[PDB]
């Protein structure tokens, strides 16, 4: 565990900078990682159920992008 803390303060800061944020309050570093994590169990759940239905032991880029597609978040650049 504890890798959720691996999503560091500078990483969140530069993500917000790309998003266009001037300054960030200190209570947001604990919220962005939570919402990001929620997105993760939303996506990898579908990914792993695709893999399980495919009788496969590994997770493929096809499965990831296609589980993304079924959530209205289509991805280009991975087939």
């Amino acid at each position: 565990r504890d890798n959720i803390q691996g999503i560091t303060k500078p990483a969140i800061r530069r993500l917000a900078r790309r998003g266009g944020v001037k300054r960030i309050s200190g209570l947001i570093y604990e919220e962005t990682r939570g919402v990001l994590k929620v997105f993760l169990e939303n996506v990898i759940r579908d990914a792993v159920t695709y893999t399980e239905h495919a009788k496969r032991k590994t997770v493929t880029a096809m499965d990831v992008v296609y589980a993304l597609k079924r959530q209205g978040r289509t991805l280009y650049g991975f087939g």
């Binding site: 579908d46 159920t49 695709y50 399980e52 239905h53 495919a54 096809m62 296609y66 079924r70």
Partner: protein, 94 residues
């Protein structure tokens, strides 16, 4: 004089099976029919899509179960999976 089909009879039997002494409105009948059709279309589309993913040409109960897991969340999903497995087992036994 075309004949139109709906799930009114089936949902009516289900309604008396759950609540023996409760009625249903005609407006609610159309709503239930629309809900059943929408869920049917969702599950069938997902099953066909998965059959396409796996280079597969047959829609069997496995991808039906996978589509149910995809659509229905959590408690609802696993209870529906249990019901489907029980129904399939009973059909095979019969």
């Amino acid at each position: 004089r075309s004949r139109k089909e709906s799930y009114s009879v089936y949902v009516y039997k289900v309604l008396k099976q759950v609540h023996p002494d409760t009625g249903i409105s005609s407006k609610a009948m159309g709503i239930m029919n629309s809900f059943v059709n929408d869920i049917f279309e969702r599950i069938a589309g997902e099953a066909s899509r998965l059959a396409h993913y796996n280079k597969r040409s047959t829609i069997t109960s496995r991808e039906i179960q996978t589509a149910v897991r995809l659509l229905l969340p959590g408690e609802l999903a696993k209870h529906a999976v249990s019901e489907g497995t029980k129904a399939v087992t009973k059909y095979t036994s019969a």
